[PDB]
mmCIF file of all heavy atoms in Angstrom:
data_model
loop_
_atom_site.group_PDB
_atom_site.id
_atom_site.type_symbol
_atom_site.label_atom_id
_atom_site.label_comp_id
_atom_site.label_asym_id
_atom_site.label_seq_id
_atom_site.Cartn_x
_atom_site.Cartn_y
_atom_site.Cartn_z
ATOM 1 N N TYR A 1 24.156 80.360 1.655
ATOM 2 C CA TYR A 1 24.340 79.971 0.269
ATOM 3 C C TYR A 1 23.019 79.480 -0.309
ATOM 4 O O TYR A 1 21.973 79.613 0.330
ATOM 5 C CB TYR A 1 25.415 78.900 0.132
ATOM 6 C CG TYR A 1 26.789 79.311 0.624
ATOM 7 C CD1 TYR A 1 27.124 79.221 1.970
ATOM 8 C CD2 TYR A 1 27.746 79.768 -0.265
ATOM 9 C CE1 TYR A 1 28.372 79.595 2.414
ATOM 10 C CE2 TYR A 1 29.006 80.135 0.179
ATOM 11 C CZ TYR A 1 29.307 80.054 1.513
ATOM 12 O OH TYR A 1 30.560 80.428 1.954
ATOM 13 N N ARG A 2 23.053 78.901 -1.507
ATOM 14 C CA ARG A 2 21.831 78.438 -2.146
ATOM 15 C C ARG A 2 22.193 77.272 -3.061
ATOM 16 O O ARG A 2 23.296 77.232 -3.607
ATOM 17 C CB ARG A 2 21.158 79.562 -2.928
ATOM 18 C CG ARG A 2 19.908 79.158 -3.697
ATOM 19 C CD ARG A 2 19.738 79.960 -4.976
ATOM 20 N NE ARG A 2 18.404 79.790 -5.523
ATOM 21 C CZ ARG A 2 17.309 80.318 -4.984
ATOM 22 N NH1 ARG A 2 17.382 81.162 -3.973
ATOM 23 N NH2 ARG A 2 16.122 80.029 -5.498
ATOM 24 N N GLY A 3 21.264 76.336 -3.214
ATOM 25 C CA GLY A 3 21.520 75.153 -4.013
ATOM 26 C C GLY A 3 20.543 74.948 -5.152
ATOM 27 O O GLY A 3 19.926 75.902 -5.633
ATOM 28 N N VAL A 4 20.411 73.703 -5.604
ATOM 29 C CA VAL A 4 19.463 73.347 -6.646
ATOM 30 C C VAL A 4 18.410 72.428 -6.045
ATOM 31 O O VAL A 4 18.642 71.763 -5.027
ATOM 32 C CB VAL A 4 20.159 72.670 -7.849
ATOM 33 C CG1 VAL A 4 20.797 73.710 -8.741
ATOM 34 C CG2 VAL A 4 21.205 71.678 -7.356
ATOM 35 N N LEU A 5 17.244 72.393 -6.684
ATOM 36 C CA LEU A 5 16.157 71.519 -6.254
ATOM 37 C C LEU A 5 16.405 70.124 -6.812
ATOM 38 O O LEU A 5 16.244 69.889 -8.022
ATOM 39 C CB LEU A 5 14.814 72.058 -6.716
ATOM 40 C CG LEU A 5 13.590 71.239 -6.289
ATOM 41 C CD1 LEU A 5 13.480 71.201 -4.774
ATOM 42 C CD2 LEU A 5 12.324 71.790 -6.917
ATOM 43 N N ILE A 6 16.800 69.198 -5.943
ATOM 44 C CA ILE A 6 17.104 67.826 -6.326
ATOM 45 C C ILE A 6 16.031 66.935 -5.716
ATOM 46 O O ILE A 6 15.825 66.960 -4.489
ATOM 47 C CB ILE A 6 18.507 67.397 -5.883
ATOM 48 C CG1 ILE A 6 19.589 68.108 -6.692
ATOM 49 C CG2 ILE A 6 18.659 65.884 -6.006
ATOM 50 C CD1 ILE A 6 19.200 68.427 -8.118
ATOM 51 N N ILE A 7 15.359 66.147 -6.538
ATOM 52 C CA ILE A 7 14.302 65.257 -6.080
ATOM 53 C C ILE A 7 14.512 63.889 -6.702
ATOM 54 O O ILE A 7 15.032 63.757 -7.828
ATOM 55 C CB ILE A 7 12.909 65.813 -6.421
ATOM 56 C CG1 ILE A 7 12.882 66.317 -7.863
ATOM 57 C CG2 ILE A 7 12.529 66.927 -5.472
ATOM 58 C CD1 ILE A 7 11.616 66.989 -8.219
ATOM 59 N N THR A 8 14.112 62.857 -5.967
ATOM 60 C CA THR A 8 14.260 61.479 -6.413
ATOM 61 C C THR A 8 12.904 60.781 -6.322
ATOM 62 O O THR A 8 12.240 60.837 -5.288
ATOM 63 C CB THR A 8 15.294 60.732 -5.573
ATOM 64 O OG1 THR A 8 16.331 61.631 -5.191
ATOM 65 C CG2 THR A 8 15.879 59.569 -6.346
ATOM 66 N N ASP A 9 12.510 60.127 -7.410
ATOM 67 C CA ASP A 9 11.262 59.385 -7.435
ATOM 68 C C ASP A 9 11.446 58.120 -8.265
ATOM 69 O O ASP A 9 12.228 58.097 -9.227
ATOM 70 C CB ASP A 9 10.118 60.229 -8.010
ATOM 71 N N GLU A 10 10.728 57.083 -7.890
ATOM 72 C CA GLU A 10 10.737 55.818 -8.605
ATOM 73 C C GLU A 10 9.390 55.615 -9.289
ATOM 74 O O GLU A 10 8.351 55.589 -8.625
ATOM 75 C CB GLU A 10 11.037 54.648 -7.666
ATOM 76 N N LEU A 11 9.417 55.477 -10.609
ATOM 77 C CA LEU A 11 8.211 55.367 -11.405
ATOM 78 C C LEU A 11 8.164 54.035 -12.136
ATOM 79 O O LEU A 11 9.179 53.576 -12.671
ATOM 80 C CB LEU A 11 8.108 56.523 -12.410
ATOM 81 N N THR A 12 6.991 53.416 -12.145
ATOM 82 C CA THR A 12 6.782 52.141 -12.827
ATOM 83 C C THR A 12 5.356 52.090 -13.349
ATOM 84 O O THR A 12 4.417 52.414 -12.623
ATOM 85 C CB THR A 12 7.041 50.964 -11.880
ATOM 86 N N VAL A 13 5.210 51.675 -14.598
ATOM 87 C CA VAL A 13 3.896 51.503 -15.228
ATOM 88 C C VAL A 13 3.768 50.040 -15.644
ATOM 89 O O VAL A 13 4.710 49.454 -16.186
ATOM 90 C CB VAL A 13 3.709 52.451 -16.431
ATOM 91 C CG1 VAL A 13 4.759 52.196 -17.503
ATOM 92 C CG2 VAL A 13 2.305 52.316 -16.996
ATOM 93 N N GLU A 14 2.613 49.450 -15.366
ATOM 94 C CA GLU A 14 2.376 48.036 -15.600
ATOM 95 C C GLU A 14 1.100 47.846 -16.416
ATOM 96 O O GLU A 14 0.261 48.739 -16.514
ATOM 97 C CB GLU A 14 2.290 47.256 -14.278
ATOM 98 N N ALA A 15 0.983 46.653 -16.994
ATOM 99 C CA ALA A 15 -0.209 46.285 -17.752
ATOM 100 C C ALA A 15 -0.591 44.840 -17.457
ATOM 101 O O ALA A 15 -0.008 44.218 -16.564
ATOM 102 C CB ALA A 15 0.036 46.489 -19.247
ATOM 103 N N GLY A 16 -1.543 44.306 -18.199
ATOM 104 C CA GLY A 16 -1.979 42.953 -17.982
ATOM 105 C C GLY A 16 -2.273 42.251 -19.288
ATOM 106 O O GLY A 16 -2.004 42.778 -20.365
ATOM 107 N N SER A 17 -2.819 41.043 -19.175
ATOM 108 C CA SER A 17 -3.144 40.251 -20.354
ATOM 109 C C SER A 17 -4.211 39.247 -19.995
ATOM 110 O O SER A 17 -4.238 38.705 -18.897
ATOM 111 C CB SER A 17 -1.900 39.533 -20.899
ATOM 112 O OG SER A 17 -1.081 40.413 -21.643
ATOM 113 N N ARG A 18 -5.116 38.993 -20.956
ATOM 114 C CA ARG A 18 -6.108 37.940 -20.801
ATOM 115 C C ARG A 18 -6.369 37.341 -22.180
ATOM 116 O O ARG A 18 -6.408 38.075 -23.176
ATOM 117 C CB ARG A 18 -7.384 38.454 -20.148
ATOM 118 C CG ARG A 18 -8.401 39.047 -21.100
ATOM 119 C CD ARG A 18 -9.342 39.985 -20.366
ATOM 120 N NE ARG A 18 -10.020 40.910 -21.274
ATOM 121 C CZ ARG A 18 -9.520 42.076 -21.640
ATOM 122 N NH1 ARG A 18 -8.336 42.489 -21.239
ATOM 123 N NH2 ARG A 18 -10.236 42.859 -22.449
ATOM 124 N N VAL A 19 -6.492 36.027 -22.240
ATOM 125 C CA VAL A 19 -6.766 35.327 -23.484
ATOM 126 C C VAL A 19 -8.191 34.799 -23.448
ATOM 127 O O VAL A 19 -8.587 34.107 -22.503
ATOM 128 C CB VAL A 19 -5.763 34.185 -23.701
ATOM 129 C CG1 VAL A 19 -5.941 33.584 -25.076
ATOM 130 C CG2 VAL A 19 -4.348 34.688 -23.501
ATOM 131 N N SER A 20 -8.973 35.128 -24.478
ATOM 132 C CA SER A 20 -10.358 34.700 -24.573
ATOM 133 C C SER A 20 -10.505 33.752 -25.746
ATOM 134 O O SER A 20 -10.032 34.048 -26.852
ATOM 135 C CB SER A 20 -11.302 35.904 -24.737
ATOM 136 O OG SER A 20 -10.778 36.826 -25.667
ATOM 137 N N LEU A 21 -11.162 32.611 -25.509
ATOM 138 C CA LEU A 21 -11.386 31.607 -26.540
ATOM 139 C C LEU A 21 -12.846 31.191 -26.513
ATOM 140 O O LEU A 21 -13.474 31.104 -25.458
ATOM 141 C CB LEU A 21 -10.480 30.394 -26.332
ATOM 142 C CG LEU A 21 -10.336 29.414 -27.498
ATOM 143 C CD1 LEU A 21 -8.951 28.800 -27.513
ATOM 144 C CD2 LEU A 21 -11.386 28.326 -27.413
ATOM 145 N N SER A 22 -13.378 30.919 -27.706
ATOM 146 C CA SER A 22 -14.751 30.447 -27.861
ATOM 147 C C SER A 22 -14.754 29.313 -28.867
ATOM 148 O O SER A 22 -14.434 29.520 -30.048
ATOM 149 C CB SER A 22 -15.673 31.584 -28.322
ATOM 150 O OG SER A 22 -14.988 32.488 -29.168
ATOM 151 N N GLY A 23 -15.109 28.104 -28.418
ATOM 152 C CA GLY A 23 -15.176 26.958 -29.290
ATOM 153 C C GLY A 23 -16.317 26.048 -28.881
ATOM 154 O O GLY A 23 -16.868 26.158 -27.794
ATOM 155 N N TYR A 24 -16.657 25.133 -29.802
ATOM 156 C CA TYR A 24 -17.754 24.211 -29.546
ATOM 157 C C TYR A 24 -17.534 22.946 -30.355
ATOM 158 O O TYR A 24 -16.771 22.945 -31.326
ATOM 159 C CB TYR A 24 -19.111 24.861 -29.889
ATOM 160 C CG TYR A 24 -19.201 25.487 -31.265
ATOM 161 C CD1 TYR A 24 -19.094 24.719 -32.416
ATOM 162 C CD2 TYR A 24 -19.398 26.851 -31.400
ATOM 163 C CE1 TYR A 24 -19.192 25.297 -33.659
ATOM 164 C CE2 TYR A 24 -19.491 27.434 -32.653
ATOM 165 C CZ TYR A 24 -19.388 26.651 -33.779
ATOM 166 O OH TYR A 24 -19.476 27.230 -35.027
ATOM 167 N N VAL A 25 -18.207 21.868 -29.940
ATOM 168 C CA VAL A 25 -18.073 20.587 -30.621
ATOM 169 C C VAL A 25 -18.561 20.716 -32.046
ATOM 170 O O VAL A 25 -19.600 21.327 -32.303
ATOM 171 C CB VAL A 25 -18.841 19.498 -29.845
ATOM 172 C CG1 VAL A 25 -18.047 19.061 -28.635
ATOM 173 C CG2 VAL A 25 -20.196 20.017 -29.421
ATOM 174 N N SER A 26 -17.814 20.138 -32.984
ATOM 175 C CA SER A 26 -18.200 20.225 -34.387
ATOM 176 C C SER A 26 -19.462 19.421 -34.643
ATOM 177 O O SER A 26 -19.566 18.255 -34.252
ATOM 178 C CB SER A 26 -17.071 19.713 -35.278
ATOM 179 O OG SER A 26 -17.464 19.702 -36.641
ATOM 180 N N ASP A 27 -20.434 20.050 -35.301
ATOM 181 C CA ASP A 27 -21.675 19.417 -35.707
ATOM 182 C C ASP A 27 -21.851 19.499 -37.207
ATOM 183 O O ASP A 27 -22.930 19.816 -37.712
ATOM 184 C CB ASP A 27 -22.875 20.036 -34.981
ATOM 185 N N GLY A 28 -20.783 19.219 -37.939
ATOM 186 C CA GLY A 28 -20.797 19.361 -39.375
ATOM 187 C C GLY A 28 -19.842 20.426 -39.864
ATOM 188 O O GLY A 28 -18.621 20.263 -39.792
ATOM 189 N N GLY A 29 -20.381 21.535 -40.369
ATOM 190 C CA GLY A 29 -19.558 22.631 -40.860
ATOM 191 C C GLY A 29 -20.102 23.241 -42.122
ATOM 192 O O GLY A 29 -20.749 22.561 -42.923
ATOM 193 N N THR A 30 -19.852 24.540 -42.314
ATOM 194 C CA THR A 30 -20.356 25.238 -43.491
ATOM 195 C C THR A 30 -19.748 24.646 -44.766
ATOM 196 O O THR A 30 -18.542 24.789 -45.011
ATOM 197 C CB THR A 30 -20.036 26.736 -43.408
ATOM 198 N N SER A 31 -20.567 23.983 -45.565
ATOM 199 C CA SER A 31 -20.108 23.308 -46.758
ATOM 200 C C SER A 31 -20.648 23.989 -48.010
ATOM 201 O O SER A 31 -21.583 24.788 -47.964
ATOM 202 C CB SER A 31 -20.519 21.833 -46.743
ATOM 203 N N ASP A 32 -20.025 23.669 -49.135
ATOM 204 C CA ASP A 32 -20.426 24.177 -50.444
ATOM 205 C C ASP A 32 -21.199 23.079 -51.163
ATOM 206 O O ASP A 32 -20.829 21.904 -51.081
ATOM 207 C CB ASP A 32 -19.225 24.620 -51.262
ATOM 208 N N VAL A 33 -22.263 23.466 -51.864
ATOM 209 C CA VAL A 33 -23.125 22.517 -52.567
ATOM 210 C C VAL A 33 -23.689 21.484 -51.597
ATOM 211 O O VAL A 33 -23.426 20.282 -51.738
ATOM 212 C CB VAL A 33 -22.370 21.835 -53.708
ATOM 213 N N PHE A 34 -24.473 21.944 -50.625
ATOM 214 C CA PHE A 34 -25.126 21.061 -49.661
ATOM 215 C C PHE A 34 -26.332 20.422 -50.340
ATOM 216 O O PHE A 34 -27.429 20.998 -50.418
ATOM 217 C CB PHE A 34 -25.527 21.846 -48.413
ATOM 218 C CG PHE A 34 -25.714 20.981 -47.194
ATOM 219 C CD1 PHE A 34 -24.784 20.021 -46.862
ATOM 220 C CD2 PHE A 34 -26.825 21.149 -46.387
ATOM 221 C CE1 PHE A 34 -24.955 19.243 -45.735
ATOM 222 C CE2 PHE A 34 -26.997 20.379 -45.256
ATOM 223 C CZ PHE A 34 -26.062 19.415 -44.938
ATOM 224 N N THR A 35 -26.129 19.210 -50.841
ATOM 225 C CA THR A 35 -27.172 18.485 -51.559
ATOM 226 C C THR A 35 -27.234 17.035 -51.078
ATOM 227 O O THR A 35 -26.256 16.480 -50.584
ATOM 228 C CB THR A 35 -26.916 18.514 -53.068
ATOM 229 N N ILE A 36 -28.414 16.446 -51.222
ATOM 230 C CA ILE A 36 -28.586 15.033 -50.910
ATOM 231 C C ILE A 36 -27.725 14.190 -51.855
ATOM 232 O O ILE A 36 -27.467 14.576 -52.995
ATOM 233 C CB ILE A 36 -30.055 14.628 -51.023
ATOM 234 N N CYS A 37 -27.262 13.051 -51.358
ATOM 235 C CA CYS A 37 -26.323 12.232 -52.112
ATOM 236 C C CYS A 37 -26.664 10.753 -51.976
ATOM 237 O O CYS A 37 -27.321 10.349 -51.013
ATOM 238 C CB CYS A 37 -24.883 12.489 -51.656
ATOM 239 S SG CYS A 37 -24.524 11.875 -50.016
ATOM 240 N N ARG A 38 -26.250 9.970 -52.968
ATOM 241 C CA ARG A 38 -26.484 8.529 -53.007
ATOM 242 C C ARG A 38 -25.146 7.844 -53.305
ATOM 243 O O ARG A 38 -24.793 7.649 -54.473
ATOM 244 C CB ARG A 38 -27.516 8.164 -54.066
ATOM 245 C CG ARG A 38 -28.821 8.930 -53.984
ATOM 246 C CD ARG A 38 -29.642 8.508 -52.782
ATOM 247 N NE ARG A 38 -30.931 9.188 -52.742
ATOM 248 C CZ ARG A 38 -31.401 9.840 -51.686
ATOM 249 N NH1 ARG A 38 -30.709 9.929 -50.571
ATOM 250 N NH2 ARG A 38 -32.592 10.424 -51.760
ATOM 251 N N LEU A 39 -24.413 7.472 -52.260
ATOM 252 C CA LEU A 39 -23.131 6.808 -52.458
ATOM 253 C C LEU A 39 -23.328 5.392 -52.983
ATOM 254 O O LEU A 39 -24.345 4.741 -52.733
ATOM 255 C CB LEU A 39 -22.314 6.780 -51.161
ATOM 256 C CG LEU A 39 -21.557 8.012 -50.673
ATOM 257 C CD1 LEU A 39 -20.344 8.235 -51.552
ATOM 258 C CD2 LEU A 39 -22.408 9.259 -50.628
ATOM 259 N N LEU A 40 -22.321 4.910 -53.710
ATOM 260 C CA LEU A 40 -22.290 3.565 -54.267
ATOM 261 C C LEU A 40 -20.860 3.051 -54.185
ATOM 262 O O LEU A 40 -19.904 3.809 -54.340
ATOM 263 C CB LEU A 40 -22.772 3.539 -55.716
ATOM 264 C CG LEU A 40 -24.163 4.091 -56.047
ATOM 265 C CD1 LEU A 40 -24.405 4.051 -57.535
ATOM 266 C CD2 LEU A 40 -25.220 3.286 -55.329
ATOM 267 N N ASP A 41 -20.731 1.750 -53.931
ATOM 268 C CA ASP A 41 -19.447 1.079 -53.933
ATOM 269 C C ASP A 41 -19.294 0.276 -55.212
ATOM 270 O O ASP A 41 -20.249 -0.349 -55.695
ATOM 271 C CB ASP A 41 -19.285 0.164 -52.711
#
């Protein structure tokens, strides 16, 4: 007699993850109208 071609396979696809961060201590900051000032109370 004759049959069918029966095959069994287990397939799995995987991935990964990484988190990247870049920071530094604040030394001021980009400001608008950077001018000398004379405070008064």
Side-chain angles (χ1 to χ4, degrees), residues 1-8 13 15-26 28-29 34 37-40:
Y1 299 84
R2 177 212 193 73
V4 280
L5 181 62
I6 290 328
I7 45 186
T8 325
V13 61
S17 281
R18 86 202 160 272
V19 188
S20 44
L21 195 148
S22 34
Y24 52 63
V25 282
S26 176
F34 202 46
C37 70
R38 308 289 183 232
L39 282 287
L40 303 177

